[PDB]
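Supplementary Methods S3. Input chains for the assembly prediction are listed below.
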Amino acid sequence: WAREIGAXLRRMADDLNAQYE
Amino acid sequence: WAREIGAXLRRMADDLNAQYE
Amino acid sequence: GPLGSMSQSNRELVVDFLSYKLSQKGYSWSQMAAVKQALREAGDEFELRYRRAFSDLTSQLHITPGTAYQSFEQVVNELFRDGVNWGRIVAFFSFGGALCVESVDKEMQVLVSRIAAWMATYLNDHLEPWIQENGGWDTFVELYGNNAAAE
Amino acid sequence: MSQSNRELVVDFLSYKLSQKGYSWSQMAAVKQALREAGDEFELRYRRAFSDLTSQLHITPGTAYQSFEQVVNELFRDGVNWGRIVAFFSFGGALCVESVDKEMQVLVSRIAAWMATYLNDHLEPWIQENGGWDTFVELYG
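Predicted C-alpha coordinates for the full assembly:
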Protein backbone atom coordinates (compact mmCIF):
# COMPACT_ATOMS: atom_id res chain seq x y z
CA TRP A 1 0.00 0.00 0.00
CA ALA A 2 -0.10 3.77 0.38
CA ARG A 3 2.07 4.11 3.48
CA GLU A 4 4.71 1.57 2.48
CA ILE A 5 4.60 4.10 -1.42
CA GLY A 6 5.39 6.95 0.98
CA ALA A 7 8.28 5.08 2.60
CA UNK A 8 9.79 3.81 -0.64
CA LEU A 9 9.14 8.18 -1.96
CA ARG A 10 11.01 8.89 1.28
CA ARG A 11 14.25 6.19 -0.56
CA MET A 12 13.88 8.55 -3.51
CA ALA A 13 13.70 11.90 -1.66
CA ASP A 14 16.46 11.44 0.92
CA ASP A 15 18.94 9.78 -1.41
CA LEU A 16 17.76 13.47 -4.22
CA ASN A 17 18.42 15.40 -1.00
CA ALA A 18 21.87 13.77 -0.52
CA GLN A 19 22.44 14.76 -4.96
CA TYR A 20 21.21 18.17 -3.83
CA GLU A 21 23.42 18.83 -0.82
CA TRP B 1 13.91 47.99 -41.23
CA ALA B 2 11.65 47.00 -38.35
CA ARG B 3 8.72 46.72 -40.78
CA GLU B 4 10.35 44.63 -43.50
CA ILE B 5 11.63 42.00 -39.79
CA GLY B 6 7.90 42.41 -39.11
CA ALA B 7 6.86 41.24 -42.58
CA UNK B 8 9.41 38.46 -42.88
CA LEU B 9 7.76 37.29 -38.70
CA ARG B 10 4.47 37.45 -40.58
CA ARG B 11 6.61 34.59 -43.53
CA MET B 12 7.08 32.51 -40.36
CA ALA B 13 3.66 33.08 -38.72
CA ASP B 14 1.53 32.28 -41.75
CA ASP B 15 3.65 29.40 -43.09
CA LEU B 16 3.14 27.99 -38.62
CA ASN B 17 -0.54 28.85 -39.17
CA ALA B 18 -0.90 27.17 -42.55
CA GLN B 19 0.68 23.66 -39.91
CA TYR B 20 -2.43 24.32 -37.82
CA GLU B 21 -5.37 26.13 -39.42
CA GLY C 1 2.54 44.26 1.01
CA PRO C 2 6.21 43.78 0.07
CA LEU C 3 6.41 40.59 -2.01
CA GLY C 4 8.47 37.66 -0.77
CA SER C 5 8.61 34.02 0.30
CA MET C 6 5.96 34.49 3.03
CA SER C 7 3.40 36.19 0.83
CA GLN C 8 3.79 33.50 -1.77
CA SER C 9 0.57 31.62 -2.46
CA ASN C 10 0.93 27.88 -1.90
CA ARG C 11 -2.21 27.38 -3.99
CA GLU C 12 -0.63 29.19 -6.94
CA LEU C 13 2.52 27.01 -6.70
CA VAL C 14 0.48 23.81 -6.60
CA VAL C 15 -1.85 24.78 -9.43
CA ASP C 16 1.20 25.72 -11.54
CA PHE C 17 3.03 22.46 -10.87
CA LEU C 18 -0.10 20.35 -11.52
CA SER C 19 -0.91 22.22 -14.76
CA TYR C 20 2.55 21.31 -15.97
CA LYS C 21 2.35 17.63 -15.12
CA LEU C 22 -1.16 17.35 -16.54
CA SER C 23 -0.09 18.99 -19.82
CA GLN C 24 2.87 16.59 -20.29
CA LYS C 25 0.29 13.82 -20.57
CA GLY C 26 -2.00 15.75 -22.90
CA TYR C 27 -4.27 16.89 -20.06
CA SER C 28 -4.95 20.29 -18.42
CA TRP C 29 -5.75 21.86 -15.05
CA SER C 30 -8.22 24.43 -16.42
CA GLN C 31 -8.81 26.39 -19.61
CA MET C 32 -6.63 29.25 -18.35
CA ALA C 33 -3.84 26.78 -17.55
CA ALA C 34 -4.31 25.08 -20.92
CA VAL C 35 -4.11 28.43 -22.74
CA LYS C 36 -0.86 29.31 -20.92
CA GLN C 37 0.70 25.92 -21.57
CA ALA C 38 -0.35 25.79 -25.25
CA LEU C 39 1.16 29.26 -25.66
CA ARG C 40 4.48 28.17 -24.13
CA GLU C 41 4.53 25.13 -26.44
CA ALA C 42 3.47 27.05 -29.55
CA GLY C 43 6.18 29.59 -28.68
CA ASP C 44 8.85 26.89 -28.41
CA GLU C 45 7.56 25.31 -31.58
CA PHE C 46 7.62 28.63 -33.43
CA GLU C 47 11.12 29.46 -32.21
CA LEU C 48 12.44 25.99 -33.05
CA ARG C 49 10.76 25.90 -36.46
CA TYR C 50 13.08 28.65 -37.68
CA ARG C 51 15.62 28.31 -34.87
CA ARG C 52 18.44 30.22 -36.53
CA ALA C 53 16.33 32.59 -38.62
CA PHE C 54 14.08 33.72 -35.74
CA SER C 55 17.16 34.35 -33.59
CA ASP C 56 19.07 36.06 -36.46
CA LEU C 57 16.00 38.31 -37.08
CA THR C 58 15.52 39.47 -33.48
CA SER C 59 19.29 39.94 -33.23
CA GLN C 60 18.95 42.36 -36.18
CA LEU C 61 16.95 44.68 -33.90
CA HIS C 62 19.38 46.78 -31.87
CA ILE C 63 17.25 47.68 -28.88
CA THR C 64 18.09 50.42 -26.41
CA PRO C 65 15.80 51.94 -23.83
CA GLY C 66 15.41 54.95 -26.12
CA THR C 67 14.45 53.01 -29.26
CA ALA C 68 12.61 49.99 -27.83
CA TYR C 69 9.03 51.23 -28.14
CA GLN C 70 9.28 52.48 -31.72
CA SER C 71 10.83 49.18 -32.85
CA PHE C 72 8.25 47.16 -30.94
CA GLU C 73 5.44 49.22 -32.48
CA GLN C 74 6.66 48.91 -36.09
CA VAL C 75 7.21 45.16 -35.94
CA VAL C 76 3.84 44.44 -34.35
CA ASN C 77 1.75 46.76 -36.56
CA GLU C 78 3.39 45.21 -39.60
CA LEU C 79 2.94 41.68 -38.19
CA PHE C 80 -0.83 42.28 -38.12
CA ARG C 81 -0.89 44.56 -41.14
CA ASP C 82 -3.50 42.61 -43.13
CA GLY C 83 -5.28 40.88 -40.26
CA VAL C 84 -5.05 38.42 -37.41
CA ASN C 85 -4.61 34.67 -37.19
CA TRP C 86 -3.48 32.45 -34.29
CA GLY C 87 -0.07 31.97 -35.91
CA ARG C 88 0.62 35.71 -35.88
CA ILE C 89 -0.55 35.86 -32.30
CA VAL C 90 2.01 33.19 -31.33
CA ALA C 91 4.69 35.13 -33.20
CA PHE C 92 3.67 38.28 -31.30
CA PHE C 93 4.30 36.44 -28.04
CA SER C 94 7.63 34.94 -29.14
CA PHE C 95 8.85 38.31 -30.38
CA GLY C 96 8.08 39.98 -27.06
CA GLY C 97 9.83 37.14 -25.24
CA ALA C 98 12.95 37.51 -27.40
CA LEU C 99 12.99 41.25 -26.68
CA CYS C 100 12.81 40.65 -22.93
CA VAL C 101 15.73 38.18 -22.80
CA GLU C 102 17.87 40.52 -24.93
CA SER C 103 16.97 43.44 -22.68
CA VAL C 104 18.21 41.53 -19.64
CA ASP C 105 21.26 40.29 -21.55
CA LYS C 106 22.27 43.91 -22.21
CA GLU C 107 21.61 45.10 -18.65
CA MET C 108 18.49 46.93 -19.84
CA GLN C 109 16.20 45.22 -17.26
CA VAL C 110 13.92 48.25 -16.97
CA LEU C 111 12.62 47.33 -20.43
CA VAL C 112 11.13 44.01 -19.24
CA SER C 113 8.08 45.45 -17.50
CA ARG C 114 7.64 48.10 -20.24
CA ILE C 115 7.59 45.41 -22.95
CA ALA C 116 5.14 43.33 -20.92
CA ALA C 117 2.93 46.40 -20.56
CA TRP C 118 3.15 47.27 -24.27
CA MET C 119 2.22 43.66 -25.05
CA ALA C 120 -0.80 43.70 -22.71
CA THR C 121 -1.99 47.03 -24.12
CA TYR C 122 -1.69 45.74 -27.69
CA LEU C 123 -3.52 42.54 -26.82
CA ASN C 124 -6.32 44.20 -24.87
CA ASP C 125 -6.74 47.05 -27.32
CA HIS C 126 -6.08 45.53 -30.73
CA LEU C 127 -6.26 41.76 -30.42
CA GLU C 128 -8.94 41.09 -27.81
CA PRO C 129 -11.93 41.99 -30.03
CA TRP C 130 -10.66 39.56 -32.73
CA ILE C 131 -9.94 36.83 -30.14
CA GLN C 132 -13.35 37.22 -28.54
CA GLU C 133 -15.17 37.19 -31.88
CA ASN C 134 -13.25 34.08 -32.96
CA GLY C 135 -14.63 32.06 -30.05
CA GLY C 136 -12.06 33.10 -27.46
CA TRP C 137 -8.82 31.50 -26.30
CA ASP C 138 -10.75 28.19 -26.25
CA THR C 139 -10.32 28.17 -30.03
CA PHE C 140 -6.53 28.47 -29.76
CA VAL C 141 -6.48 25.63 -27.20
CA GLU C 142 -8.41 23.36 -29.54
CA LEU C 143 -6.37 24.35 -32.61
CA TYR C 144 -2.84 24.43 -31.21
CA GLY C 145 -2.93 22.88 -27.74
CA ASN C 146 -4.92 19.80 -28.74
CA ASN C 147 -3.43 19.25 -32.18
CA ALA C 148 0.07 18.52 -33.50
CA ALA C 149 1.52 20.33 -36.52
CA ALA C 150 0.59 18.70 -39.85
CA GLU C 151 4.37 18.36 -40.17
CA MET D 1 -10.67 39.28 -20.23
CA SER D 2 -8.01 41.99 -20.10
CA GLN D 3 -6.35 40.76 -16.91
CA SER D 4 -6.57 37.38 -18.59
CA ASN D 5 -4.37 38.74 -21.36
CA ARG D 6 -1.93 40.35 -18.91
CA GLU D 7 -1.59 37.05 -17.04
CA LEU D 8 -0.93 35.30 -20.35
CA VAL D 9 1.76 37.85 -21.15
CA VAL D 10 3.41 37.43 -17.72
CA ASP D 11 3.34 33.63 -17.93
CA PHE D 12 4.81 33.59 -21.36
CA LEU D 13 7.59 36.06 -20.51
CA SER D 14 8.30 34.24 -17.21
CA TYR D 15 8.86 31.15 -19.33
CA LYS D 16 11.19 32.76 -21.88
CA LEU D 17 13.17 34.43 -19.11
CA SER D 18 13.62 31.16 -17.23
CA GLN D 19 14.81 29.34 -20.36
CA LYS D 20 17.80 31.70 -20.18
CA GLY D 21 18.30 31.50 -16.42
CA TYR D 22 16.56 34.76 -15.59
CA SER D 23 13.36 35.29 -13.62
CA TRP D 24 10.28 37.45 -14.08
CA SER D 25 9.83 37.37 -10.29
CA GLN D 26 10.77 35.22 -7.30
CA MET D 27 7.42 33.47 -7.68
CA ALA D 28 8.14 32.72 -11.38
CA ALA D 29 11.60 31.44 -10.40
CA VAL D 30 10.11 29.14 -7.74
CA LYS D 31 7.55 27.75 -10.20
CA GLN D 32 10.09 27.00 -12.88
CA ALA D 33 12.59 25.56 -10.38
CA LEU D 34 9.78 23.25 -9.15
CA ARG D 35 8.64 22.09 -12.63
CA GLU D 36 12.22 21.12 -13.50
CA ALA D 37 12.98 19.50 -10.12
CA GLY D 38 9.77 17.48 -10.63
CA ASP D 39 10.96 16.44 -14.11
CA GLU D 40 14.39 15.47 -12.83
CA PHE D 41 12.91 13.41 -10.00
CA GLU D 42 10.46 11.62 -12.33
CA LEU D 43 13.07 10.92 -15.02
CA ARG D 44 15.76 9.98 -12.49
CA TYR D 45 13.38 7.46 -10.92
CA ARG D 46 11.21 6.76 -13.95
CA ARG D 47 10.82 2.98 -13.58
CA ALA D 48 10.63 2.89 -9.78
CA PHE D 49 8.36 5.95 -9.60
CA SER D 50 5.99 4.73 -12.29
CA ASP D 51 5.84 1.29 -10.63
CA LEU D 52 5.05 2.85 -7.20
CA THR D 53 2.23 4.95 -8.68
CA SER D 54 0.76 1.81 -10.17
CA GLN D 55 0.53 0.31 -6.66
CA LEU D 56 -2.20 2.71 -5.64
CA HIS D 57 -5.94 2.18 -5.92
CA ILE D 58 -7.81 5.43 -6.37
CA THR D 59 -11.51 6.21 -6.05
CA PRO D 60 -13.21 9.55 -5.53
CA GLY D 61 -14.31 8.37 -2.09
CA THR D 62 -10.93 7.31 -0.70
CA ALA D 63 -8.18 9.18 -2.55
CA TYR D 64 -7.85 11.70 0.28
CA GLN D 65 -7.12 8.90 2.76
CA SER D 66 -4.51 7.42 0.43
CA PHE D 67 -2.93 10.86 -0.03
CA GLU D 68 -2.69 11.42 3.74
CA GLN D 69 -1.06 8.00 4.24
CA VAL D 70 1.56 8.53 1.52
CA VAL D 71 2.39 12.06 2.64
CA ASN D 72 2.55 11.59 6.40
CA GLU D 73 4.95 8.70 5.79
CA LEU D 74 6.97 10.87 3.36
CA PHE D 75 7.44 13.42 6.15
CA ARG D 76 7.32 11.08 9.18
CA ASP D 77 10.58 12.32 10.74
CA GLY D 78 10.68 15.84 9.29
CA VAL D 79 11.23 17.90 6.16
CA ASN D 80 13.95 18.44 3.52
CA TRP D 81 14.02 19.86 -0.05
CA GLY D 82 14.20 16.36 -1.56
CA ARG D 83 11.00 15.35 0.23
CA ILE D 84 9.26 18.52 -0.82
CA VAL D 85 10.05 17.71 -4.47
CA ALA D 86 8.79 14.11 -3.98
CA PHE D 87 5.66 15.58 -2.45
CA PHE D 88 4.90 17.65 -5.59
CA SER D 89 5.80 14.86 -7.98
CA PHE D 90 3.50 12.56 -6.06
CA GLY D 91 0.65 15.05 -6.21
CA GLY D 92 1.25 15.37 -9.95
CA ALA D 93 1.17 11.61 -10.51
CA LEU D 94 -2.00 11.33 -8.43
CA CYS D 95 -3.69 13.89 -10.70
CA VAL D 96 -2.53 12.14 -13.87
CA GLU D 97 -3.69 8.76 -12.56
CA SER D 98 -7.00 10.34 -11.62
CA VAL D 99 -7.56 11.57 -15.18
CA ASP D 100 -6.42 8.25 -16.68
CA LYS D 101 -9.14 6.63 -14.56
CA GLU D 102 -11.86 9.13 -15.57
CA MET D 103 -11.80 10.64 -12.07
CA GLN D 104 -11.08 14.26 -13.02
CA VAL D 105 -13.33 15.45 -10.16
CA LEU D 106 -10.35 14.64 -7.89
CA VAL D 107 -7.88 17.05 -9.51
CA SER D 108 -9.01 20.34 -7.95
CA ARG D 109 -9.33 18.43 -4.69
CA ILE D 110 -5.77 17.13 -4.79
CA ALA D 111 -4.62 20.69 -5.37
CA ALA D 112 -6.49 21.80 -2.24
CA TRP D 113 -5.10 18.94 -0.09
CA MET D 114 -1.58 19.85 -1.24
CA ALA D 115 -1.87 23.61 -0.69
CA THR D 116 -3.36 22.99 2.76
CA TYR D 117 -0.57 20.56 3.60
CA LEU D 118 2.09 23.02 2.37
CA ASN D 119 0.45 25.73 4.37
CA ASP D 120 0.23 23.77 7.60
CA HIS D 121 3.21 21.42 7.61
CA LEU D 122 5.83 22.51 5.10
CA GLU D 123 5.93 26.32 4.95
CA PRO D 124 7.29 26.68 8.52
CA TRP D 125 10.33 24.56 7.61
CA ILE D 126 10.74 26.33 4.26
CA GLN D 127 10.82 29.82 5.82
CA GLU D 128 13.12 28.50 8.57
CA ASN D 129 15.65 27.51 5.91
CA GLY D 130 15.79 30.83 4.07
CA GLY D 131 12.56 30.52 2.10
CA TRP D 132 11.85 29.44 -1.48
CA ASP D 133 14.98 31.36 -2.51
CA THR D 134 17.12 28.67 -0.93
CA PHE D 135 15.38 26.11 -3.14
CA VAL D 136 15.80 28.16 -6.33
CA GLU D 137 19.55 28.47 -5.63
CA LEU D 138 20.29 24.79 -5.08
CA TYR D 139 17.75 23.32 -7.56
CA GLY D 140 18.73 25.88 -10.20
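The CA atoms of residues 43 and 93 of chain C lie 7 Å apart. Chain C touches chain B at residues 42, 45-46, 49-50, 53-54, 57-58, 60-61, 70-71, 74-81, 85-88, 90-91, 95, 143-144, 147, 149-151 (CB under 8 Å).
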